[PDB]
Coordinates of C-alpha atoms and ligand atoms in Angstrom, one line a residue:
Chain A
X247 CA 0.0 0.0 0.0
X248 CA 1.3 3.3 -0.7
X249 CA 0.5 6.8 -0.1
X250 CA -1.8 8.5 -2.7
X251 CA -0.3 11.5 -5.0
X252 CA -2.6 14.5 -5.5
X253 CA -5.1 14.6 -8.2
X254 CA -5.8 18.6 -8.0
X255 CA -6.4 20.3 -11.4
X256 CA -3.4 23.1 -11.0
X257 CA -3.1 25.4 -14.0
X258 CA 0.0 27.3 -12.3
X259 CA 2.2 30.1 -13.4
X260 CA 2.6 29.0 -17.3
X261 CA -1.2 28.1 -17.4
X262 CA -0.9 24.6 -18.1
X263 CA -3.8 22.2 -18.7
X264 CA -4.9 19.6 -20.9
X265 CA -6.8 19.1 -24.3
X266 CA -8.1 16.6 -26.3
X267 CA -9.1 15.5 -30.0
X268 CA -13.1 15.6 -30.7
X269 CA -14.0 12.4 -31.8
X270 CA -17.1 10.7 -33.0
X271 CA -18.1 7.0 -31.1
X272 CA -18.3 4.8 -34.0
X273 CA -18.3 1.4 -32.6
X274 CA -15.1 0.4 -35.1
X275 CA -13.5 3.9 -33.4
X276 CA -10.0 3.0 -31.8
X277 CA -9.9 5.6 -29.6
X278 CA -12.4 8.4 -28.4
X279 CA -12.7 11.1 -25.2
X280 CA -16.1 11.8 -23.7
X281 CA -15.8 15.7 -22.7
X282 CA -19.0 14.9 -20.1
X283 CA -17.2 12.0 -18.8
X284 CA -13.5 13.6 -19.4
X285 CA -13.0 10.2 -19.7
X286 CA -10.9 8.5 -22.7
X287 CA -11.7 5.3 -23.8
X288 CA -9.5 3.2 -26.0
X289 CA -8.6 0.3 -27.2
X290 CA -5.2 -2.2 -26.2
X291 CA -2.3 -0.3 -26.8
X292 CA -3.7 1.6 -29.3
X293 CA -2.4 4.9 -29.8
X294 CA -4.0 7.8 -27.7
X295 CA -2.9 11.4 -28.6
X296 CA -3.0 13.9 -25.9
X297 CA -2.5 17.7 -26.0
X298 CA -0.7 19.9 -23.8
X299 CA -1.5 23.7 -23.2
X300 CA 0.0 26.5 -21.6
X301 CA -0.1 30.3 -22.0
X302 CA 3.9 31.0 -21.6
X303 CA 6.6 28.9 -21.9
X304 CA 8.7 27.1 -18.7
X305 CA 11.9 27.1 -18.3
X306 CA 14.2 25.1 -19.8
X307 CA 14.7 21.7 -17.8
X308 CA 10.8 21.3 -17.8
X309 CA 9.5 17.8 -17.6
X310 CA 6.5 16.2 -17.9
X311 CA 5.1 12.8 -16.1
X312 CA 2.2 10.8 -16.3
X313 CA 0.9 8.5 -13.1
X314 CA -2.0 6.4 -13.5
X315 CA -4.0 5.8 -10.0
X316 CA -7.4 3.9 -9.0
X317 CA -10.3 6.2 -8.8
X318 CA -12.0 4.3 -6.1
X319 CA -11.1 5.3 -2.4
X320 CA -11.1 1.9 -1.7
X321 CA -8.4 1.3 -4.5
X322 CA -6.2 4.3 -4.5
X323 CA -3.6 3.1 -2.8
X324 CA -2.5 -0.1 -4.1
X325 CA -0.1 0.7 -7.4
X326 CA -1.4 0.5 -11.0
X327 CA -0.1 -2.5 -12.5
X328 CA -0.6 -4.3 -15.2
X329 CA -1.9 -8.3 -14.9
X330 CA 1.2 -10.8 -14.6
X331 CA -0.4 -12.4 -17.8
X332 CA 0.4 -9.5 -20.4
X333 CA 3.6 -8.6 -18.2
X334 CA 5.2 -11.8 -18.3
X335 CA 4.6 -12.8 -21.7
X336 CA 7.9 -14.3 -23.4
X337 CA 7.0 -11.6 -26.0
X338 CA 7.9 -8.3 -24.6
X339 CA 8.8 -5.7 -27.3
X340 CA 11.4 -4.3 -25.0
X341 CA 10.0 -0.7 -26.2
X342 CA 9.5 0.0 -22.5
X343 CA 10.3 -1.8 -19.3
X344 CA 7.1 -4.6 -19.3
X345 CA 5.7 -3.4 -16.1
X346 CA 4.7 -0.3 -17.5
X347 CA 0.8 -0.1 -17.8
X348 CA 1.7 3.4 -19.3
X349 CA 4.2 4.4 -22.3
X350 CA 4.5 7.1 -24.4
X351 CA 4.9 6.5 -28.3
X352 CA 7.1 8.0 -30.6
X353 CA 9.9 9.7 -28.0
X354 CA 13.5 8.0 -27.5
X355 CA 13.7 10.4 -24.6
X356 CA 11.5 8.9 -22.4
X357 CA 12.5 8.2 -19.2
X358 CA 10.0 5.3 -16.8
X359 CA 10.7 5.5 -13.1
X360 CA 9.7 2.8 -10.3
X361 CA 9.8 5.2 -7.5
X362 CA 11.9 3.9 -4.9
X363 CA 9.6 5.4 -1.6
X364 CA 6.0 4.4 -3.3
X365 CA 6.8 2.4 -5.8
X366 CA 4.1 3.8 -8.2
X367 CA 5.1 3.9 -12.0
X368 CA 5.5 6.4 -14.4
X369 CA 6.8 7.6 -17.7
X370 CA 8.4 10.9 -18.0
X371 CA 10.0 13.4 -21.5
X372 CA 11.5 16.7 -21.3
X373 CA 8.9 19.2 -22.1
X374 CA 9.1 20.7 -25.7
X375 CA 7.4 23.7 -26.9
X376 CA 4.7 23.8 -29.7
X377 CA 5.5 23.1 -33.5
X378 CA 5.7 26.1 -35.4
X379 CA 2.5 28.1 -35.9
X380 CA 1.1 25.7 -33.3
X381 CA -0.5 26.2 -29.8
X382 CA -0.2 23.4 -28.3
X383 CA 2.3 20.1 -28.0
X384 CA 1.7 16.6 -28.4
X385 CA 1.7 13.7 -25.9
X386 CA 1.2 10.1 -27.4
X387 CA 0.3 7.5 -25.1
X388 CA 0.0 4.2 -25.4
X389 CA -2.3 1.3 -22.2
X390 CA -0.5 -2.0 -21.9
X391 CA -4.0 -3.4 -20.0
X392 CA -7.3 -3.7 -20.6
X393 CA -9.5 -2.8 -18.1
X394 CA -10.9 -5.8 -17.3
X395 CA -7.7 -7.6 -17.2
X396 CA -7.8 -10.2 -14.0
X397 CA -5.3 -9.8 -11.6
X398 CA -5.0 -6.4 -13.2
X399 CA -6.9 -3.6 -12.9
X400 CA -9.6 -6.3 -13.0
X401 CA -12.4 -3.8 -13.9
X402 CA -11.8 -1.2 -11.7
X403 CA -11.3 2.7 -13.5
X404 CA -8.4 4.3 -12.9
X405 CA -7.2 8.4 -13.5
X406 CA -4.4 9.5 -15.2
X407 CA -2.5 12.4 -13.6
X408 CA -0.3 14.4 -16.1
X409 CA 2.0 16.9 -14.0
X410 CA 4.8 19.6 -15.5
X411 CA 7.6 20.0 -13.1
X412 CA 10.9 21.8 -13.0
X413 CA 14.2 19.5 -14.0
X414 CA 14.5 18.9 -9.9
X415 CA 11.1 17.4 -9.8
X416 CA 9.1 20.2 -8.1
X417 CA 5.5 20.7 -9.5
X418 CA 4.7 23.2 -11.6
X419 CA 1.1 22.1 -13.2
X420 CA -1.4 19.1 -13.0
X421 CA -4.5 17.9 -14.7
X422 CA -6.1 14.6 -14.9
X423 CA -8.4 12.5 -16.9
X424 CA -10.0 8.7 -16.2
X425 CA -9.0 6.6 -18.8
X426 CA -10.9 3.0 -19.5
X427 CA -8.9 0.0 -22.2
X428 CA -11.6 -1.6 -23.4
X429 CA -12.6 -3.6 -26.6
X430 CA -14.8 -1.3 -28.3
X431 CA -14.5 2.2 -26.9
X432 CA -17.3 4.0 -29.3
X433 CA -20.3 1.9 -27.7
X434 CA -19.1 2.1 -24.4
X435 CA -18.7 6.0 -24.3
X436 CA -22.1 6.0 -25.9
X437 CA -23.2 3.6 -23.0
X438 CA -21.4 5.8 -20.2
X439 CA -22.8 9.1 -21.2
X440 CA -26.7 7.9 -21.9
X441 CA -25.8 6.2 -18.1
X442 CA -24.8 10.1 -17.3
X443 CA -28.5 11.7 -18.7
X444 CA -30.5 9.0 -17.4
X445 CA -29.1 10.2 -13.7
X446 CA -28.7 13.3 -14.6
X447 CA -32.9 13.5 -16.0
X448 CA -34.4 11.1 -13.0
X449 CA -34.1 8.0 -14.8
X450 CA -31.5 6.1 -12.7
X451 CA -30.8 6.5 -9.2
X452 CA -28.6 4.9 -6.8
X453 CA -28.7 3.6 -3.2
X454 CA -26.4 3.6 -0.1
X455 CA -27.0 0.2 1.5
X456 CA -25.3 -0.6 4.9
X457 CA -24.2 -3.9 5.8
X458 CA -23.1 -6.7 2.8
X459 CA -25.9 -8.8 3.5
X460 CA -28.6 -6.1 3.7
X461 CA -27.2 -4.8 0.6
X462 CA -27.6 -8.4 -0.8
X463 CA -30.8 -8.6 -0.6
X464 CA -31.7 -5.4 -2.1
X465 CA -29.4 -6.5 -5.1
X466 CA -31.5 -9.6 -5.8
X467 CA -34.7 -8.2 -5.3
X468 CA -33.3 -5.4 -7.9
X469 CA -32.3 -8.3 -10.4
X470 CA -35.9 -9.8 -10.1
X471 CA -38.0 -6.6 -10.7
X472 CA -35.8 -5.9 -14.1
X473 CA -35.6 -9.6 -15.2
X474 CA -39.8 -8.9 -14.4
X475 CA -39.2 -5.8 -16.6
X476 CA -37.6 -8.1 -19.8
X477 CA -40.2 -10.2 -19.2
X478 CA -42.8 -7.8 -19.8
X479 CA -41.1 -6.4 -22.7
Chain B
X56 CA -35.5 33.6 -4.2
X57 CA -31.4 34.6 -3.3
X58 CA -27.8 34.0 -4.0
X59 CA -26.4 31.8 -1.3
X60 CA -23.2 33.1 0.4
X61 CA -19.8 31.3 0.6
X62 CA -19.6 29.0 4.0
X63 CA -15.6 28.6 3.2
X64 CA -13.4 28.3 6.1
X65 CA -11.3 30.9 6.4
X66 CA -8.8 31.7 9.4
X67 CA -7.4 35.0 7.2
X68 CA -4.6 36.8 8.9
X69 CA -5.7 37.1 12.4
X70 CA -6.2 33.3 12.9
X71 CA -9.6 33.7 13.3
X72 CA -12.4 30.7 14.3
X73 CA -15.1 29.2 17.0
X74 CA -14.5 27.9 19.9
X75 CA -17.8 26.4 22.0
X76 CA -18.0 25.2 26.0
X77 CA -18.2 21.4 26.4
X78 CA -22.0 20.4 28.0
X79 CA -23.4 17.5 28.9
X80 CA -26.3 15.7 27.2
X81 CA -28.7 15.1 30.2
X82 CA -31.8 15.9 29.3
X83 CA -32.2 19.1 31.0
X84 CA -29.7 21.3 29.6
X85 CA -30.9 23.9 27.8
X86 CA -27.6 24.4 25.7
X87 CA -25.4 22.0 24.2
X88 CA -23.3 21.4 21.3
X89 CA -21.9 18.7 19.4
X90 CA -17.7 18.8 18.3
X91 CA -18.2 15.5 16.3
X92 CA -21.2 17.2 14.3
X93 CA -20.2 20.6 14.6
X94 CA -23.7 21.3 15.8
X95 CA -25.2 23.1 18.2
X96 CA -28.6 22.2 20.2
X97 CA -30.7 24.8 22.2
X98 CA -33.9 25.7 23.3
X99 CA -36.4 28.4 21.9
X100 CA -34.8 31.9 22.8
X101 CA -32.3 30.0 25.6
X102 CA -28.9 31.9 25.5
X103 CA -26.4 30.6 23.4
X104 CA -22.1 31.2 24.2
X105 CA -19.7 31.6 21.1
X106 CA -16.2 31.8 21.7
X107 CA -13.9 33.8 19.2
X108 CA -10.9 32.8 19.0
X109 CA -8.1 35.6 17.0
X110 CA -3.9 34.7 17.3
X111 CA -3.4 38.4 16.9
X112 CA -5.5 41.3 17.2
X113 CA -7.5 43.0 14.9
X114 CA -7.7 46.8 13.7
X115 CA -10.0 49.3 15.1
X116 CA -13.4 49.1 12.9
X117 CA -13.5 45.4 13.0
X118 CA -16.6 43.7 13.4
X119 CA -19.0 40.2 13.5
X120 CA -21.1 39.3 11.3
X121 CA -24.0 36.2 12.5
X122 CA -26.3 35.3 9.5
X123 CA -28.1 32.2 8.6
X124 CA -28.6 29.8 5.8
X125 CA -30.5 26.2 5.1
X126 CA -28.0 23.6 4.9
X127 CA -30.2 21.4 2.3
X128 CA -28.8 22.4 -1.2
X129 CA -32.6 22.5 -2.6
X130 CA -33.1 25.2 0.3
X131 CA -30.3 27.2 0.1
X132 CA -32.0 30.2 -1.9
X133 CA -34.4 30.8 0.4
X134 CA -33.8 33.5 2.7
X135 CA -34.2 32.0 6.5
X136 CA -37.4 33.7 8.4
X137 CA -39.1 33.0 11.6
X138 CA -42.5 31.7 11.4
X139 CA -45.2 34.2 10.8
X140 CA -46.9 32.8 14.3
X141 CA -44.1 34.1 16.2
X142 CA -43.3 36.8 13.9
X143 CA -46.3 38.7 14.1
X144 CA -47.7 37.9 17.4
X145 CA -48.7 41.2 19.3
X146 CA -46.9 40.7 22.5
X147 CA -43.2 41.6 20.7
X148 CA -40.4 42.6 22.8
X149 CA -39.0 45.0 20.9
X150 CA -35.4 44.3 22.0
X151 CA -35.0 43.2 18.0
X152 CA -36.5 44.1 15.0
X153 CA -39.6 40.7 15.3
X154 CA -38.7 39.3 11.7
X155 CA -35.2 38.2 12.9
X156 CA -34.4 35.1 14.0
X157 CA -31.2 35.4 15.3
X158 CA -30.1 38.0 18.1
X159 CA -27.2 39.1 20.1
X160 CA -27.9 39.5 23.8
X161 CA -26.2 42.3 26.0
X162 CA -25.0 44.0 23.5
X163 CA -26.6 47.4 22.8
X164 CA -24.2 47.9 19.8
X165 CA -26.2 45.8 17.9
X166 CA -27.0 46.3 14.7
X167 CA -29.9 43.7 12.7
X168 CA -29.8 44.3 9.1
X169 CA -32.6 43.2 6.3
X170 CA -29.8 43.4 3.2
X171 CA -31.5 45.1 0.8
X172 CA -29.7 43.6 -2.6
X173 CA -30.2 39.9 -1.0
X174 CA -32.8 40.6 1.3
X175 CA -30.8 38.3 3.8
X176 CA -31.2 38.8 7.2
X177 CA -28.2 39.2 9.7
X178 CA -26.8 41.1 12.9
X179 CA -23.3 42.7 13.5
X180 CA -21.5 43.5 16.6
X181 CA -18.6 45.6 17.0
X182 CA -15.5 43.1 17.8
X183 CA -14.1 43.8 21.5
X184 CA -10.5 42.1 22.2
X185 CA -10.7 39.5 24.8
X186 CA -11.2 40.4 28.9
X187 CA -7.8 40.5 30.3
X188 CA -6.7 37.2 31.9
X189 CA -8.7 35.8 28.7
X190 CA -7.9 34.5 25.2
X191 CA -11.0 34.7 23.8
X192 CA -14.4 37.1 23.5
X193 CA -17.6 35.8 24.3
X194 CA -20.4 36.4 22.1
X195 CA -24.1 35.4 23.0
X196 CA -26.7 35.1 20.8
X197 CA -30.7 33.8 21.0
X198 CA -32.2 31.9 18.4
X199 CA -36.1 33.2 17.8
X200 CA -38.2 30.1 16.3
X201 CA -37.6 26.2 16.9
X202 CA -36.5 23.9 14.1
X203 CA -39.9 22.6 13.5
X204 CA -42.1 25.9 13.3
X205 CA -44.3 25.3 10.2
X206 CA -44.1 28.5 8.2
X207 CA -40.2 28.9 8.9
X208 CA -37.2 26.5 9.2
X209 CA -40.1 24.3 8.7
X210 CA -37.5 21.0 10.3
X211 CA -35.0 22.1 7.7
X212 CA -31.8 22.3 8.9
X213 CA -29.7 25.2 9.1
X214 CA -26.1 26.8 9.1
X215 CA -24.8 29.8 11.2
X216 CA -22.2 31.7 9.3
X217 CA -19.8 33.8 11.8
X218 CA -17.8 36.2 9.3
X219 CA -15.0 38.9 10.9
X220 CA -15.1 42.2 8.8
X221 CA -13.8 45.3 8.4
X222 CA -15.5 48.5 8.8
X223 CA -16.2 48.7 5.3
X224 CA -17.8 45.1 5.1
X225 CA -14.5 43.5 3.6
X226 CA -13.7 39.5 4.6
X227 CA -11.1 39.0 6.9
X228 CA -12.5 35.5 8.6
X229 CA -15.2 33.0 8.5
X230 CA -16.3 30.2 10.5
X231 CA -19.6 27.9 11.4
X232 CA -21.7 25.7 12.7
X233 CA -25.3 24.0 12.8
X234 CA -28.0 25.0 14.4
X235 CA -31.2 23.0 16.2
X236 CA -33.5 25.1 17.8
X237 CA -36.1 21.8 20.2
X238 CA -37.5 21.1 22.8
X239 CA -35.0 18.6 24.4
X240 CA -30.8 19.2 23.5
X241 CA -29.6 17.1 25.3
X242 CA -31.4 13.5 24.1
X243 CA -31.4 15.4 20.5
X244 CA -27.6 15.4 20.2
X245 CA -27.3 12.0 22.0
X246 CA -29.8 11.0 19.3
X247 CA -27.6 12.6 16.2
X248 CA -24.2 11.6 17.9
X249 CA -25.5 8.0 17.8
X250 CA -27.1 8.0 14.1
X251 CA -23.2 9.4 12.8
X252 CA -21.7 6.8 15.5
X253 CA -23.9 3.9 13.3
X254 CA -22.7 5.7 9.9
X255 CA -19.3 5.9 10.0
X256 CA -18.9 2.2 11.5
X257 CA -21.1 0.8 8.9
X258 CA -19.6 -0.6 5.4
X259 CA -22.0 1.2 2.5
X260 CA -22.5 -0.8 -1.3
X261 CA -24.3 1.1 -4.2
X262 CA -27.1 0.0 -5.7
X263 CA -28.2 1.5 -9.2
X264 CA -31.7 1.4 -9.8
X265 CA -34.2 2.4 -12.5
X266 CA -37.1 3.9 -11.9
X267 CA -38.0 6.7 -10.1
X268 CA -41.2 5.0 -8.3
X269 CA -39.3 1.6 -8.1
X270 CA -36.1 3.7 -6.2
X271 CA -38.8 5.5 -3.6
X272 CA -40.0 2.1 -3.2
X273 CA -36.4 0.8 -1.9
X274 CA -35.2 4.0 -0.3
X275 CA -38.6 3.8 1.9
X276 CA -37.9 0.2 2.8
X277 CA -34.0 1.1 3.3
X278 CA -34.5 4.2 5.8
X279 CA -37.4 1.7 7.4
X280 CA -34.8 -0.8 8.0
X281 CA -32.0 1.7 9.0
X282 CA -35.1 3.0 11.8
X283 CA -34.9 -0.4 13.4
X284 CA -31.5 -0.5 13.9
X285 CA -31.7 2.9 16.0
X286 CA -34.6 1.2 17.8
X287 CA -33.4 -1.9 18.8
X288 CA -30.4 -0.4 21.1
Ligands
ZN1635 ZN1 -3.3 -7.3 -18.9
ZN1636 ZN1 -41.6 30.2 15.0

């Protein structure tokens, strides 16, 4: 168990703060970010761009690192790892160290740290201004996990913390978005945002039950009244 | 219908916050708060001691500000009143303007003001440094209506905000805490200690339901079966 890093959006000095691709949710879509959600979904280490903003330029030394992290309290301090399955493998591209749920693609200068006090993972690159008659600078990521992979994150979403720090380490900006590796990421946005109006327009609700058993019970009563409901139609 | 002012915490420069006299819970006090829920319990119109608590002095001008607000986010636009009962009833005492329902005793600096941009209701004092041989001042106020009067707070909780100002009105602290105006303190905060003591050693599970009938249907049975286990003990 380790102690959980800070997931406060902090636009700092430089203005710093992420941005991201508008996409449509085509179910043959390889990767796609719900703004409602700020959630990206995307497929096994497929490719997932990521944009970085900032009104003035840091100084030179800059660096920035990206942490993944459970989103559940209950979660949030055991380390983000990937499954032994997909780590193990006899087939590691050696592109990055194979414990690495996260990489970054396309950058010889990236750097992956185990820290030695937490021993969370992450992948760090020196920061680099924007492309000429451009506003912003590119990040490509790449998941090694699925979501659902047992043993894994075995189902359980997870938030990805980008942070822009000085060449010592010391923070200079942080933003965030949850992140889900799944098979076909067009339906399930599609699926996670109706999920979002239905709550948000008295459609679904939720429940705090107390006790496991108690709650139990109101689960299978639940499953009866909907398998009554397919029933019926 | 109003906007709702800030509740922030705010010490400021001068270190400023509460500070409240421990009571006991038999059922005859009249006055009694609560540390674990931050809450206060007193009787209609029974005196009610607040400590303020500064690490260094502040300038001449400086005043307290006591105004009130419904917790409930649904209720938090509506300006708190007394009832109309005790509002308008002949036999006033005229030591405060009848519409308010909170008042500072022994103070004749007093000053009740009906905002006339928010149409809040609130009263200021002058801020007196502390008797010497004393770290803190003593301010005493009176609540006008009980929790339950029908036609006011109607059983709807509410929040006192305690706000240190300059003489111009500026912000230089904030600070508060609940209020329950009934019939019996004591058994009330026994009552409320015991429901949080049940809540925070119980283990909660979510349950998402559809249906905004079927989940009224649940919640009913689950606050019905949470009421027994305050009853049996
Ligand atoms: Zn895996
Ligand atoms: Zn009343």
């Amino acid at each position: 168990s380790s102690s959980v890093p800070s997931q406060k959006t902090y636009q700092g000095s430089y203005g710093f703060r992420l941005g991201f691709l508008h996409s449509g949710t085509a179910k043959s879509v390889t990767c796609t970010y719900s703004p409602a959600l700020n959630k990206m979904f995307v497929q096994l280490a497929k490719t997932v761009p990521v944009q970085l903003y900032v009104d003035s330029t840091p100084p030179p030394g800059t660096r920035v690192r990206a942490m993944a992290i459970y989103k559940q309290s209950q979660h949030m301090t055991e380390v983000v790892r990937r499954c032994p399955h997909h780590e193990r493998s006899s087939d590691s591209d050696g592109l990055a160290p194979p414990q690495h749920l996260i990489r970054v693609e396309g950058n010889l200068r990236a750097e992956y740290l185990d820290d030695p006090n937490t021993f969370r993972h992450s992948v760090v690159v020196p920061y680099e201004p924007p492309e000429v008659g451009s506003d912003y600078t590119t990040i490509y990521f790449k998941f090694m996990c699925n979501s659902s992979c047992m043993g894994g994150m075995n189902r359980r979403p997870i938030l990805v913390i980008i942070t822009l720090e000085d060449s010592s380490g010391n923070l200079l900006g942080r933003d965030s978005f949850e992140v889900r590796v799944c098979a076909c990421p067009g339906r399930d946005r599609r699926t996670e945002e109706e999920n979002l109006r239905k709550t948000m327009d008295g459609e679904y609700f939720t429940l705090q039950i107390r006790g496991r058993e108690r709650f139990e019970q109101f689960r299978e009563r639940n499953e009866a009244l909907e398998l009554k409901d397919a029933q019926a139609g």
